């Protein structure tokens, strides 16, 4: 029933857009997109760029959890998500989430649900560069 | 005896080893324990990144430390998660 | 001080992409969008159109409205929303919203806000036309 | 005597009405119950609308329908907002 449109690991940048439109249903009364971007500031500290690398599962993995978010799911039509690896200039999209659903409450929960499940349970990490040319690794300082 | 296992480093993990992966020699029947107490030991920083880490083991989360290891099995050491 | 790119009321096609595009803010990590379309059917019947009409007062209650959801907001960058009124076929959008914040969780709930508040207190009324050649006035059935 | 006010319909109100404003006669004093009354008893499907709507008087909500309206008095009939 729920459909999964997109589950995709990509060096190649994303868009919102693009997964707004790929969710589109005739049924569907609600989208509800979600964008994760590369903050300027981190701790107080300016952020140069990161770099997300992937344990050689992610791309399987992530498929897999975008289908169990979608067949878990009720009142949701169409899901996608994308996450970007690679090199990442500050203000760029790491993560694009659509979800679209008959009505505003599925999407909305869908979404950020979504949302949690990837950055949880996804193995890639994220190296974070900072300006004064130090450099931290997530979950790991 | 002994037998040789490869283990392969991601992320902190990586950074803190020197390399992406590392061929350990170990007595025959080491846990996955004596292993990771092994790396550990030698370097400071990796064995703080060691001890949050999950890992895998041919590809199978691994459960109990206490398992055995087999010749030629591989390791993969996983820190925690930092997606988005 | 959380900002309004825009509080628009129009008879022209509106686009989630441009809100996104509006509400982007150097130090927002989390961009939430909300998309609301017509649907093909409604209580069973097929949809033919939609026609939207609202009170004179419309415009400026919408703009009060989202400077309230901005204000009382916290974690929040920007905030930008535009409803449609007019004639609108099936699958286009009525409402949209976007939301920059900081963080994921203001970003998601701000949003959700924005939405639930623009469609309860602002006046504009949606009278459906189905295909079988009947017509409704929501909430005045 | 009497004054004249107007009234202006919207959407489902406007429908049932027939038109989109309607200059009312009324006794000077005559209140906005007094006005909707009115309304109500000439058209059967008007009244079922107008009974959920709220109104406004030259651009403010009529919080009691007991108050006096005034010559050249605006009244705005509103049904439930339906947006989105």
């Given at each position: 029933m729920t459909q999964v449109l997109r589950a995709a690991l990509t060096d190649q940048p994303i868009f919102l857009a693009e997964h707004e439109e790929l969710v589109s249903?005739?049924?569907?009364g609600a989208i509800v997109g979600f964008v994760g971007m590369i903050r300027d500031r981190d701790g107080g500290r300016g952020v140069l760029r990161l770099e997300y690398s992937a344990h050689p599962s992610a791309a399987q993995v992530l498929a897999d959890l975008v289908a169990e978010v979608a067949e878990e799911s009720s009142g949701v039509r169409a899901v996608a998500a994308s996450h970007r690896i690679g090199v990442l200039q500050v203000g760029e999209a790491a993560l694009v989430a659509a979800v679209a659903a008959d009505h505003r409450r599925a999407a909305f929960g869908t979404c950020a649900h979504l949302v949690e499940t990837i950055k949880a349970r996804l193995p890639v990490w994220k190296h974070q560069f900072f300006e004064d040319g130090t450099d931290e690794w997530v979950g790991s300082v | 005896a002994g037998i040789q296992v490869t283990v392969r480093y991601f992320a902190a993990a990586r950074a803190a080893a020197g390399a992406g992966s590392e061929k350990v020699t170990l007595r025959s029947g080491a846990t996955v324990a004596e292993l990771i107490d092994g790396l550990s030991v030698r370097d400071v920083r990796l064995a703080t990144v060691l001890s949050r880490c999950s890992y895998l083991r041919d590809g199978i989360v691994?459960?109990?430390?206490?398992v055995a290891l087999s010749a030629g099995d591989t390791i993969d050491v996983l820190p925690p998660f930092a997606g988005g």
């Open positions: 249903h005739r049924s569907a | 691994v459960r109990d430390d206490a």
